[PDB]
Structures are given as structure tokens and as C-alpha cells.
A paper describes a structure:
The HLAI residues that are polymorphic are mainly those forming the peptide-binding groove, which contains six binding pockets (A to F) that define the size and chemical characteristics of the specific peptide repertoire that can be accommodated by each HLAI molecule. Cognate T-cell receptors (TCRs) expressed on CD8+ T-cells detect pathogen-derived peptides presented by HLAI molecules on the surface of infected cells. In this study we focus on two HIV-1-specific epitopes and their presentation by 4 different members of the HLA-B7 superfamily, HLA-B*07:02, HLA-B*42:01, HLA-B*42:02 and HLA-B*81:01. We show that single polymorphisms between different alleles of the HLA-B7 superfamily can induce a conformational switch in peptide conformation that is associated with differential HLAI-specific escape mutation and immune control.
We next analyzed the structures of HLA-B*07:02, HLA-B*42:01, HLA-B*42:02 and HLA-B*81:01 in complex with the well characterised RM9-Nef epitope. Pro2 and Met9 acted as primary anchor residues and Arg1, Val4 and Arg7 pointed away from the groove for potential TCR interactions. The total number of contacts, buried surface area and surface complementarities were comparable in all four structures. Despite distinct selection pressure at position 1 of RM9-Nef by HLA-B*07:02 (R71K), peptide residue Arg1 was in a similar conformation in all 4 HLAIs. Leu6 was in an identical position within HLA-B*42:01 and HLA-B*42:02, but moved by 3 Å in HLA-B*81:01 and 1.5 Å in HLA-B*07:02. These differences were mediated by polymorphisms at residues 156 and 152 within the α2 helix. The larger side chains of Arg156 and Gln152 in HLA-B*07:02 pushed Leu6 up compared to the smaller side chains of Leu156 and Val152 in HLA-B*81:01, changes which may be linked to the L76V/T/I selection that is mediated only by HLA-B*81:01. The four closely-related RM9-Nef peptide-HLAI structures show that similar conformations do not preclude HLAI-specific selection pressures, such as for R71K, that is only observed in the context of HLA-B*07:02. Our structural analysis demonstrated that R71 (position 1 in the peptide) pointed up, away from the HLAI groove and could therefore act as a putative TCR contact. A dominant R71K mutation in the Nef71-79 occurred in those with HLA-B*07:02 but not B*42:01/02 or B*81:01.
Residue numbers in the entry:
A (entry chain B): 0 to 99
B (entry chain C): 1 to 9
C (entry chain A): 0 to 276
Amino acid sequence: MIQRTPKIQVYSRHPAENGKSNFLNCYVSGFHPSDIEVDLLKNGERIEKVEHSDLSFSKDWSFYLLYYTEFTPTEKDEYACRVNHVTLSQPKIVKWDRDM
Amino acid sequence: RPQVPLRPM
Amino acid sequence: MGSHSMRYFYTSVSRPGRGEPRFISVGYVDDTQFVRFDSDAASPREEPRAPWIEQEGPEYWDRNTQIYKAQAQTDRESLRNLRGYYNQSEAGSHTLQSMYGCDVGPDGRLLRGHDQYAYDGKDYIALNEDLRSWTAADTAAQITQRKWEAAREAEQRRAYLEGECVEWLRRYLENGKDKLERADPPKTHVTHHPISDHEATLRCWALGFYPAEITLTWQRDGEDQTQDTELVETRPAGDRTFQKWAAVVVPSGEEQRYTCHVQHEGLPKPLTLRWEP
């Protein structure tokens, strides 16, 4: 390593309530170098209107970024974040748990 | 306001 | 402590054979991002990322855009010189990062200045806190140190951090004052999360707070439960506020002997909150 693998959190901006406007967030942090691939998935498929913040970094020089999209949760719509980075064997995938 | 760039490394 | 900070974060990444290094800047007051610049934009210019910097007029934006366009060229030379010093090939991608700014106290005066650099994710060179000397990480950065000592460049850096940085931050605090000088306390609660008649997780939430600095901790009759807590690292909501939670698996039936404790600058008094059945 002079390449750190990204930590990944998936979470909503507001406490989820089904059939109510929200934002799905994928926070990737702690990674180096700065090239990284983030997709937000719904039921396994790629959401196209996705935005991310400006590229920044922590005092240890590691980068971070928030990927986000408007959405409306439902009782079992399955949302997740898929992340590729040169430190990973293959894309890393994190399901959205509305309790975390 | 950012700083005016200095000499390169 | 009525205390504030301004920081600029630069990243340049080379991409050999594919045109020049990409240069990206972001600017923060405290934990509020307020400006960006991206050399790959169709018309690269500094742009507002907070509503209170918009009140600066087009001359302010032009000037900073010129700064960034010049810094980009400077970081490209740097990248070129770095590759040479480390005896690296012309084909690989490399990263030069810069971070600089000031911390000031409630009196508005300079507490500490910062100006330092990293190559490929590792410390390269930094201005020491006296703002008159350098620390170099290895023999390659001593080559840079010798150049910058010969030119007395620390004098120019000092002038910026003591003279400029400080007054710009005051200006921005005055423009942004109800968003920058106000803390937003965490809205909080405790959720019950039973895993069986075996266990039960008390997850404790702090949502919607600013600034990011916080402390969430649990107790068992008083005693800190450091070993037996899962804590997420603090994370952006995306609306300029932050979130964190802290969880703990507690033997099923003993939940109400446990108390979450929240500390944050936005609350007069620390909170000792419990699960609501």
C-alpha cells in the first residue's frame, strides 16, 4: 500500500419513510489514488441521474466523495452502491440498510 | 481567496 | 471556541500521453465547502459552492480563476520535476496534493498557518509553524527545499497566511455569518434493534449537525463501552450537515441500564438520552 482502499457507507439523508422523497447517499472515503468508480443501483441496475461532490481530501491526504441521487424508498426496493478502485480485486458492493 | 502560486518544486 | 479555519485543497493528477495533468481545487471555511475549480471543465473558472460567496462580484471570480489557471501550470512543472527526482518513468500517473490555510481565534487573529504538500499520497514538504522554515520528507524534497530557501519563498507564504488568509476568512465569516457562526445541534434519538430473545442493539443517532466534530458514546451504569460499540465514521448528509450513529448489542432485558451520551458544540448541555418504548 501507498494506495488505501475506500471505506464505503450507504445511507439516506433523512430517516426513510416509504413513498416519501429522500436522497440516497454513497460515501466513499480513505482512498488513494483519486480515480474511483461509483454507481448507485436499484434492484441491481444502474441509476443514471447520479451526482457526486467536488473531489477533496482528509488530513492524511486520502480522498473522499459523496455520490447521491433523489429517490423514493419502498417496502422492498433494493438499493446499493458499487465501487471499483485499483486497490480492489473486483467491484465492492454495499446494500442500503435503512437502519444504518 | 487562494494564494498566488509560487515556484515549482 | 469562537475559533475558525480556512483551507484550500489542491489535487493535480498527471495522465501521460493524454494531455496535461488535471487540476482540481476546493475551498473550505470550517466544514463548509464554498468554492471549486476544475481544469477539465468546458470553461474552467472558480465557481460558488455556498450561497454566501455569490455576493462577491465578477472581479473576485476572475481573479481567482486566473490564480487557479496559473497554479495549474505550476503544478505541472512540479509534477515533471518530481518524476525526475524520483527517477520514475514518463508513462505513469502521479498525484501532487497541496493543503494550506489559516486557523484564527475569536479575536480574529492567526493561531496557526499551514502550507504543505504530498506526492503520491505521502508527505513531501511542509512549511513549519514558524512560517520561516521547511520540513522535507526525504532527499528528493531537499532538492525542492534548497530551491525555495534560495529564493526565500517562505516570506511570500508567510505574507499570505498572516496577512491575506486571515482577512479573507473574516470577510467570508461576515458574508456567511448566520451559516458559519451558528452551530446546528444534532437531532437525536435511540432506536431499538432486537436480534432475538438473545440480544438487542441500541443504535444511537445524531443527525443534521454542524460542524462535523461530535462525540457519541455509551455507558453501562456509568462505564464507557469502548470495546463493545460499533461506531460509524461521521458522514455528510449532502445538505451541508453531518450524521453519526453508535450501536451496542446488549443482553436482551438489560437495555434500560444503558445511556447514550452526545457532545457537540451546538448544545449548551451534553445529552444523556435513552430508548423510548
